[PDB]
Design an enzyme around this catalytic site. Structure first.
Site, PDB file in Angstrom:
ATOM      1  N   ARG A  92       0.820  -1.201   0.000  1.00  0.00           N
ATOM      2  CA  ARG A  92       0.000   0.000   0.000  1.00  0.00           C
ATOM      3  C   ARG A  92       0.860   1.260   0.000  1.00  0.00           C
ATOM      4  O   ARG A  92       1.728   1.425   0.857  1.00  0.00           O
ATOM      5  CB  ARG A  92      -0.938   0.015   1.203  1.00  0.00           C
ATOM      6  CG  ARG A  92      -1.844   1.228   1.212  1.00  0.00           C
ATOM      7  CD  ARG A  92      -2.835   1.198   2.362  1.00  0.00           C
ATOM      8  NE  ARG A  92      -2.212   1.345   3.676  1.00  0.00           N
ATOM      9  CZ  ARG A  92      -2.214   2.471   4.386  1.00  0.00           C
ATOM     10  NH1 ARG A  92      -2.800   3.555   3.910  1.00  0.00           N
ATOM     11  NH2 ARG A  92      -1.629   2.511   5.577  1.00  0.00           N
ATOM     12  N   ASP A  95      -2.702   6.498   1.185  1.00  0.00           N
ATOM     13  CA  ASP A  95      -3.295   6.671   2.498  1.00  0.00           C
ATOM     14  C   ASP A  95      -4.417   7.711   2.422  1.00  0.00           C
ATOM     15  O   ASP A  95      -4.186   8.855   2.029  1.00  0.00           O
ATOM     16  CB  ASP A  95      -2.211   7.120   3.476  1.00  0.00           C
ATOM     17  CG  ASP A  95      -2.684   7.131   4.900  1.00  0.00           C
ATOM     18  OD1 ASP A  95      -3.303   6.139   5.320  1.00  0.00           O
ATOM     19  OD2 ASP A  95      -2.407   8.119   5.605  1.00  0.00           O
ATOM     20  N   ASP A  97      -6.952   9.423   4.947  1.00  0.00           N
ATOM     21  CA  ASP A  97      -7.268   9.639   6.355  1.00  0.00           C
ATOM     22  C   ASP A  97      -8.368  10.676   6.488  1.00  0.00           C
ATOM     23  O   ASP A  97      -8.338  11.718   5.827  1.00  0.00           O
ATOM     24  CB  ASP A  97      -6.041  10.143   7.115  1.00  0.00           C
ATOM     25  CG  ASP A  97      -4.993   9.079   7.330  1.00  0.00           C
ATOM     26  OD1 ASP A  97      -5.231   7.910   6.986  1.00  0.00           O
ATOM     27  OD2 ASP A  97      -3.921   9.431   7.849  1.00  0.00           O
TER      28      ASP A  97
HETATM   29  N1  LIG Z   1      -9.459   9.557  11.130  1.00  0.00           N
HETATM   30  C1  LIG Z   1      -9.114   8.349  10.655  1.00  0.00           C
HETATM   31  N2  LIG Z   1      -8.957   8.164   9.326  1.00  0.00           N
HETATM   32  C2  LIG Z   1      -8.585   6.953   8.892  1.00  0.00           C
HETATM   33  N3  LIG Z   1      -8.319   5.844   9.587  1.00  0.00           N
HETATM   34  C3  LIG Z   1      -8.464   6.055  10.906  1.00  0.00           C
HETATM   35  C4  LIG Z   1      -8.853   7.249  11.493  1.00  0.00           C
HETATM   36  N4  LIG Z   1      -8.921   7.128  12.882  1.00  0.00           N
HETATM   37  C5  LIG Z   1      -8.562   5.884  13.126  1.00  0.00           C
HETATM   38  N5  LIG Z   1      -8.289   5.187  11.981  1.00  0.00           N
HETATM   39  C6  LIG Z   1      -7.814   3.817  11.951  1.00  0.00           C
HETATM   40  O1  LIG Z   1      -6.430   3.823  11.596  1.00  0.00           O
HETATM   41  C7  LIG Z   1      -6.147   2.437  11.345  1.00  0.00           C
HETATM   42  C8  LIG Z   1      -4.805   2.315  10.681  1.00  0.00           C
HETATM   43  O2  LIG Z   1      -4.854   3.016   9.414  1.00  0.00           O
HETATM   44  P1  LIG Z   1      -3.465   3.281   8.679  1.00  0.00           P
HETATM   45  O3  LIG Z   1      -3.840   3.986   7.418  1.00  0.00           O
HETATM   46  O4  LIG Z   1      -2.689   2.011   8.549  1.00  0.00           O
HETATM   47  C9  LIG Z   1      -2.573   4.419   9.735  1.00  0.00           C
HETATM   48  P2  LIG Z   1      -1.637   5.600   8.778  1.00  0.00           P
HETATM   49  O5  LIG Z   1      -2.591   6.561   8.110  1.00  0.00           O
HETATM   50  O6  LIG Z   1      -0.641   4.887   7.921  1.00  0.00           O
HETATM   51  O7  LIG Z   1      -0.856   6.436   9.879  1.00  0.00           O
HETATM   52  P3  LIG Z   1      -1.383   7.783  10.661  1.00  0.00           P
HETATM   53  O8  LIG Z   1      -2.688   7.408  11.319  1.00  0.00           O
HETATM   54  O9  LIG Z   1      -0.240   8.085  11.598  1.00  0.00           O
HETATM   55  O10 LIG Z   1      -1.552   8.877   9.649  1.00  0.00           O
HETATM   56  C10 LIG Z   1      -7.368   1.936  10.578  1.00  0.00           C
HETATM   57  O11 LIG Z   1      -7.587   0.567  10.745  1.00  0.00           O
HETATM   58  C11 LIG Z   1      -8.503   2.840  11.013  1.00  0.00           C
HETATM   59  O12 LIG Z   1      -9.488   2.092  11.748  1.00  0.00           O
HETATM   60  N1  LIG Z   2       5.332  13.599   4.203  1.00  0.00           N
HETATM   61  C1  LIG Z   2       4.473  12.658   4.711  1.00  0.00           C
HETATM   62  N2  LIG Z   2       4.934  11.789   5.563  1.00  0.00           N
HETATM   63  C2  LIG Z   2       4.038  10.887   6.072  1.00  0.00           C
HETATM   64  N3  LIG Z   2       4.524   9.984   6.957  1.00  0.00           N
HETATM   65  C3  LIG Z   2       3.670   9.109   7.454  1.00  0.00           C
HETATM   66  C4  LIG Z   2       2.308   9.086   7.095  1.00  0.00           C
HETATM   67  N4  LIG Z   2       1.822   9.960   6.230  1.00  0.00           N
HETATM   68  C5  LIG Z   2       2.672  10.855   5.714  1.00  0.00           C
HETATM   69  C6  LIG Z   2       2.145  11.826   4.746  1.00  0.00           C
HETATM   70  O1  LIG Z   2       1.004  11.892   4.325  1.00  0.00           O
HETATM   71  N5  LIG Z   2       3.156  12.703   4.298  1.00  0.00           N
HETATM   72 MG   LIG Z   3      -2.030   8.577   7.647  1.00  0.00          MG
HETATM   73 MG   LIG Z   4      -4.365   5.999   7.137  1.00  0.00          MG
END
Ligand SMILES: Nc1ncnc2c1ncn2[C@@H]1O[C@H](COP(=O)(O)CP(=O)(O)OP(=O)(O)O)[C@@H](O)[C@H]1O
Ligand SMILES: Nc1nc2nccnc2c(=O)[nH]1
Ligand SMILES: [Mg+2]
Ligand SMILES: [Mg+2]
Ligand SMILES: [Cl-]
EC number: 2.7.6.3
Length: 158
Positions: A92, A95, A97
């Site tokens: 993957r 992302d 979020d």
């Molecule tokens: N606001 C949100 N948006 C998306 N996923 C969320 C979220 N809040 C919690 N989650 C949860 O986050 C879990 C892990 O998602 P990932 O995409 O692997 C984390 P990431 O986005 O890589 O890191 P980050 O959360 O530090 O940005 C999901 O299984 C989901 O349930």
């Molecule tokens: N620059 C950057 N770094 C990151 N590191 C972890 C997760 N998301 C990110 C993201 O969206 N941007």
């Molecule tokens: Mg993220």
């Molecule tokens: Mg995520």
């Protein structure tokens, strides 16, 4: 509800994945895209041996429940979040979020909204500020205030 979604991709050449993701976001049921930020180029928070991230923000009008939206964003990650390499499918790199979901506060096993770390991340805040400069968080904090307080550097466009 206006949901604000952060897009990140750290493919070497991410534009086509990001566009595919944007189109898919526009196909989510009971929803439509209101506006999309510029694409920004942001270094990874670690060794410089990794690709830059492309980061953007999307405003999505939706009548879906927050968890239903998450189902769709997670589906999109599964369906178009990996790119086929020569021999195999890659991991993957996309992302999606959920940064904010209207003015709602969500704390469930699956969801934390506002996004748990967005206030520490210029790569999330700056694209959001481009498209929503007057944004207020559920607790009354303003986006402008967070950027003013932390002084995160502005991002280069892709
Ligand atoms: N606001 C949100 N948006 C998306 N996923 C969320 C979220 N809040 C919690 N989650 C949860 O986050 C879990 C892990 O998602 P990932 O995409 O692997 C984390 P990431 O986005 O890589 O890191 P980050 O959360 O530090 O940005 C999901 O299984 C989901 O349930
Ligand atoms: N620059 C950057 N770094 C990151 N590191 C972890 C997760 N998301 C990110 C993201 O969206 N941007
Ligand atoms: Mg993220
Ligand atoms: Mg995520
Ligand atoms: Cl809490």
């Amino acid at each position: 509800t206006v949901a604000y979604i952060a897009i990140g991709s750290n493919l070497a050449s991410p534009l086509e994945q990001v566009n595919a993701a944007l189109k898919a976001l526009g196909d989510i049921p009971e929803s439509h895209i209101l506006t999309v930020s510029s694409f920004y180029r942001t270094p990874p928070l670690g060794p410089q041996d990794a690709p830059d991230y492309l980061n953007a923000a999307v405003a999505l009008e939706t009548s879906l429940a927050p968890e239903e939206l998450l189902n769709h964003t997670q589906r999109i990650e599964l369906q178009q979040g990996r790119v086929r390499k020569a021999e195999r499918w890659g991991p993957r790199t996309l992302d999606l979020d959920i940064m904010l979901f209207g003015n709602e506060v969500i704390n469930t096993e699956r969801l934390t909204v506002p996004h748990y770390d967005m206030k520490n991340r210029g790569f999330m805040l700056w694209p959001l500020f481009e498209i929503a400069p007057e944004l207020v968080f559920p607790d009354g904090e303003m986006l402008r205030q967070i950027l003013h307080t932390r002084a995160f550097d502005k991002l280069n466009k892709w």
